[PDB]
Amino acid sequence: SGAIYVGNYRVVNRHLATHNDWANLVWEDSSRDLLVSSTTAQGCDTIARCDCQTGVYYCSSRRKHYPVSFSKPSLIFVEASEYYPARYQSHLMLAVGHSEPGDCGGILRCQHGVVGIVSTGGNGLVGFADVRDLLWLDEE
Ligand SMILES: NC(=O)[C@H]1CCCN(C(=O)NCC2CC2)C1
Ligand SMILES: [Zn+2]
Numbered sequence: 001s002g003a004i005y006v007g008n009y010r011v012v013n014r015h016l017a018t019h020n021d022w023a024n025l026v027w028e029d030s031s032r033d034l035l036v037s038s039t040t041a042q043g044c045d046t047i048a049r050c051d052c053q054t055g056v057y058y059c060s061s062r063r064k065h066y067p068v069s070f071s072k073p074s075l076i077f078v079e080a081s082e083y084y085p086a087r088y089q090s091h092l093m094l095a096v097g098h099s100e101p102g103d104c105g106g107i108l109r110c111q112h113g114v115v116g117i118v119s120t121g122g123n124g125l126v127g128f129a130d131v132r133d134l135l136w137l138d139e140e
Helices: 019-023
Strands: 002-015 025-031 035-042 055-061 064-069 074-078 087-096 107-110 113-120 125-128
Touching: 019 025, 019 035, 025 087, 035 087, 055 113, 055 125, 087 113
Parallel strands: none
Antiparallel strands: 002 035, 025 035, 055 064, 055 107, 074 087, 087 125, 107 113, 113 125
């Protein structure tokens, strides 16, 4: 579990969104596994606006932050799970690292701010849903 709190927005994995998230919906995209809802309180996270390929992510199943090298956001095939059929997930970045069910929502960050959140795992790979292209998170 986990979310990004930027401005008056809450960014979560779409597959983990709550009823309150759907009832206060700003934007959602199943192909990216992202959903954004509105918040009453202002958050403290800031979004990175860059093309970094190195950063640090939080792994809840290890209680540890790990430094990683990650691929550029792209269209990647993700196997069938209990949340989605086998499909191409867009804006996904992969790295070598531990990720098991429960780790979605952990933040990946670089020197510029939050880059994205954990969205996939297994086989010694961790995948992150990028948010750096969502420029509207910084305003309104
Ligand atoms: N983005 C996806 O299609 C996910 C949905 C949850 C299931 N899935 C995973 O890779 N889970 C393993 C660890 C928790 C990350 C694919
Ligand atoms: Zn950066």
